[PDB]
Amino acid sequence: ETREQRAIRLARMSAYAARRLAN
Numbered sequence: 521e522t523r524e525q526r527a528i529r530l531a532r533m534s535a536y537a538a539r540r541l542a543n
């Protein structure tokens with residue numbers, strides 16, 4: 521994965537995780 525794909529991956533994984541595990 522490149523800097524772009526990787527980054528967006530971080531936001532997606534973190535975002536999704538935060539949703540299913542906000543607290």
